[PDB]
Design a binder for this molecule. Structure first.
Ligand code: NA
Ligand code: NA
Lengths: 217, 230
């Protein structure tokens, strides 16, 4: 991704250098008095919120390259009591304190636009997911997630694409033949069934991630 | 507002004039290939999507002042096939083609930040509401929505916290079918009283308990407003 690679250049050029993070560690946490702009260059992460009681809530996932900002750009205060936990074996991320980000984003606006549109993708992503649930119920949510897994972590094979109410819906899917489980691995082969019940999400991939969407279309 | 009125005057310095819209009109629509940046200055609107069926889904409500963009700021292409519909009797909005707004954003940094953190408020808002739904279902969502309106429009009075909201927008939210059941339940439990054609919140703590992460969101995003009713 050129825009992401170009952002990395500008960070490296200004003195910011990548940091390595192991699985399960937090690139930022909900108890830190200081807020950070994270440029996740490689690896997989999840956003979480931990209650007084201690329950973990998984709110969303991010794969690099992407930008996740734990503080408002102006006031520099938290946007929410959230943690950014590495779930891939390792992750590469640039950790910028938010008061410094406002300095380098001032000089150049092209870079600023790249961070700006990552927020836009997040906003439209949530709207697309909400739209699908509110029509096809839990069927839309699960096919939405499967289509997400199929677009990002998919690998085509000649047979297949390789990777409670919920349990019943999954059972229907295998029965309907949309997804096939063979030889210790899971394979999708009716991509357009997922698209019918997660239509807005498919639209979002097309308009937001056309290179990713185009690989299997 | 403070940071919004200076954005208004920034746009005016540059020559963009306010346009007025009326209820049921679309400020932008999902079939226009030209994408826009909307500075909703006054009024209430809602983001809609039309499905294959033709069924209408309401996705988000926005009040002025706020910024709604139909396209990505750099690529200039659509972020989603959406319509922005006016529901208040009248709405005032500055409509900028995505082409022009980028040159303006470049000139100023402080007004960039303003548009930037309205997106941030929306990102965190969606996660907060997701959280509250995963815990309390549509009761959490409706209490969460009533809590925002309470903070934003709530004037404390002897008869409770009155939600000063014209009924044209109040009857759009379903306060005048799953919403009716929830509203009637809060009435039965005396969380709200409906008098003189307006909602009076009697038990704010009840709303906060069922929408805790939206309460947190609002506190972190507008602490001064959050402070009056708390
Ligand atoms: Na933090
Ligand atoms: Na449009």
């Amino acid at each position: 991704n050129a825009q992401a690679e170009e952002f990395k250049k500008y960070l490296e050029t200004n003195g910011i250098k990548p940091k390595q993070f192991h699985k399960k560690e937090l690139i930022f946490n909900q108890w830190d008095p200081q807020e950070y702009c994270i440029f996740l260059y490689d690896g997989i992460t999840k956003l979480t919120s931990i209650s007084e009681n201690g329950t973990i809530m998984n709110l969303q996932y991010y794969k690099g390259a992407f930008v996740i900002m734990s503080g408002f750009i102006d006031t520099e205060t938290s946007v929410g009591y959230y943690n950014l936990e590495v779930i891939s074996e390792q992750a590469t991320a640039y950790v910028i304190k938010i008061n410094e980000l406002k300095e380098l984003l001032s000089k150049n606006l092209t870079h600023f636009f790249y961070v700006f549109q990552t927020l836009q993708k997040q906003v439209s992503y949530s709207l697309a997911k909400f739209n699908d649930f509110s029509i096809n119920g839990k069927l839309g949510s699960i096919c939405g997630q499967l289509l997400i897994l199929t677009y990002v972590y998919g690998k085509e094979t000649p047979d297949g694409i390789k990777i409670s109410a919920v349990s019943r819906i999954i059972s229907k899917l295998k029965q309907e033949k949309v997804i096939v489980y063979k030889n210790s691995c899971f394979y999708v082969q009716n991509l357009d069934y997922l698209k019918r019940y997660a239509p807005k999400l498919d639209e979002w991939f097309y308009l937001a991630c056309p290179a990713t969407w185009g690989k299997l279309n």
